Structures are given as structure tokens and as C-alpha cells.
Write a protein that binds this ligand. Structure first.
Ligand SMILES: O=C(O)c1ccc(Nc2nccc(Nc3ccccc3Cl)n2)cc1
Length: 264
């Protein structure tokens, strides 16, 4: 009816964010495993986000997709807000990407279809701008890809390197430039993901925030040799200063290179 903390057993922290942690967890009776997002709400006050969080769990509770991480429920005690989340066993595509250093065209094209389907679902539900950079993407039961998004950025301990430092790389020129953004932002993201999948780094990566901005806004990015032309064409068509010049989502799914190497 309404949950509370003691309905759950708590395991390790999966990741730690600035507003709180995602703990591995299971409902007490069913012994069923899930993820508990814990938000401190004191850091929520300062940061000035409560309200929109509170209609978030409204909007996200309504969403259902294979490739979207499902929000089971939510509750609060006094000092903390809890998101009851679908558990994704295999973690972040960002770790996986760190493993192999790069993906191949199967992996990529399939992830991309998986992503395109979610966003396309998302739009129909009137939900835009989902942050799909790799560290908010999780890996489900066997191979499947899940957009986590929602709550604010969580890291499993690792690396350090790029902390962020990972920010604008995925941000579209219109967003960076402080301008009204529409559904088409998410296709910019897609273009950046795809590139990173194959290359191992994002196209605009640079040692300074300024320079990164320089490259994004001016859309300056160059492929290493191995990138297939069909890859290039999709990326190129995906990353355009003009939103209107970028494909609709099904165009992506229909793309020659997508359909070729996509397991899905
Ligand atoms: O540490 C690992 O190997 C690891 C990280 C995440 C895992 N699964 C999972 N499921 C549901 C939500 C969620 N939040 C989250 C946790 C850390 C980073 C990013 C996100 Cl979205 N994470 C499993 C293992």
C-alpha cells in the first residue's frame, strides 16, 4: 500500500551520488531484489529541486519500456526520499566501455536501436531530453540496455580520471548556448553515444571546457580510420548544428548501417 524502509533488506551501495546513494536491496518477504535510490532531501532543499522531483515520480511511474529502467514505487520517511527501482545486474555501459575500450558495430547498432526505441516511446509519452550518456545507461538480465536517468548523477567507485569533465560532451550546441531546446536534442546525444561506442572517446573531448565548447558549437569532430562509412553517415546526419537538420527517430532505426549490424 505504502512502503517504508524496513520493508527492505539493504546490500552494498551500487553507486553514490551527490544527493544520495543507490543501494542494492530486496523486499523482505518476497526476497525479491531491487535498487533503492536514497535522496538526502537536505541537499535537495539547497539545490532547489523538490517539486519537479515530486512530479517526476509522477511521470516516470507511468513509463514502461524494456529499455527504460522501471520505477516500481516511492515513499519517504522524514529526512529521505526513496525511489524503488528495477535492478540492473550488469551495471553501467560505461564500465563495460571501459573494459573493452571500444565496442563493435553489432553491439553499437543494437544499443542504438534499443536507445532509439526508448526515446521514441518517451516522446509519445511527452518526455524529452533524457540523459543517455553511458554512465546513466545500465545493463539488464543478459544483454539488454536500460536508460536510468531520473535522479542525479551516481557513480560506482572507479577510475577517477574523467569525473566530470564528462559534461558538455553529450550536451547539444542549443542547450549549451542557453536556448529553447526541443525533442531533437536527444538525437544529438545519440550521435555522440554512437561515436563513443566505436571510438572509445566522445568526439568533442578536450582538456579544457572552453575548447570542448569550441568543438561542439562549431561541430568539429574527426573519425579515426576504422569507422565505417555507414557509421560516419549516421553520426554525421545525427550531429548537426541545426536541430531541424537531424533525423527523426525512426529514420535512425531505418538507417542502412543500423539495420545491417543490429541484433534488434
Ligand atoms: O557497481 C556496479 O558494478 C553496479 C552498478 C549498477 C548496478 N545496477 C543498477 N541497477 C539499477 C540502478 C542502478 N543505479 C546506478 C548505480 C551506479 C551507477 C549508475 C546508476 Cl544509474 N544500478 C549493478 C552493479
Amino acid at each position: 500500500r505504502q512502503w517504508a524502509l524496513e520493508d527492505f533488506e539493504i546490500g552494498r551501495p551500487l553507486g553514490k551520488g551527490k544527493f544520495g546513494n543507490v543501494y542494492l536491496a530486496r523486499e523482505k518477504q518476497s526476497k525479491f531484489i531491487l535498487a533503492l535510490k536514497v535522496l538526502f532531501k537536505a541537499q535537495l532543499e539547497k539545490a532547489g529541486v523538490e517539486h519537479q522531483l515530486r512530479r517526476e515520480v509522477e511521470i516516470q511511474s507511468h513509463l514502461r519500456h524494456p529499455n527504460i529502467l522501471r520505477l516500481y514505487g516511492y515513499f519517504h520517511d522524514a529526512t529521505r526520499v526513496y525511489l524503488i527501482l528495477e535492478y540492473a545486474p550488469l551495471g553501467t555501459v560505461y564500465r563495460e566501455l571501459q573494459k573493452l575500450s571500444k565496442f563493435d558495430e553489432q553491439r553499437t547498432a543494437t544499443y542504438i536501436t534499443e536507445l532509439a526505441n526508448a526515446l521514441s516511446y518517451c516522446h509519445s509519452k511527452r518526455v524529452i531530453h533524457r540523459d543517455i550518456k553511458p554512465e546513466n545507461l545500465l545493463l539488464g538480465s543478459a544483454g539488454e540496455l536500460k536508460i536510468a536517468d531520473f535522479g542525479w548523477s551516481v557513480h560506482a567507485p572507479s577510475s577517477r580520471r574523467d569525473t566530470l569533465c564528462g559534461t558538455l560532451d553529450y550536451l547539444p550546441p542549443e542547450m549549451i548556448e542557453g536556448r529553447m531546446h526541443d525533442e531533437k536534442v536527444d538525437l544529438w546525444s545519440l550521435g555522440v553515444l554512437c561515436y563513443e561506442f566505436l571510438v572509445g572517446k566522445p568526439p568533442f573531448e578536450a582538456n579544457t571546457y572552453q575548447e570542448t565548447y569550441k568543438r561542439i558549437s562549431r561541430v568539429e569532430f574527426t573519425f579515426p580510420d576504422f569507422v565505417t562509412e555507414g557509421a560516419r553517415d549516421l553520426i554525421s546526419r545525427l550531429l548537426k548544428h541545426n536541430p531541424s537538420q537531424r533525423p527523426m527517430l525512426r529514420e535512425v532505426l531505418e538507417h542502412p548501417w543500423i539495420t545491417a549490424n543490429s541484433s534488434k
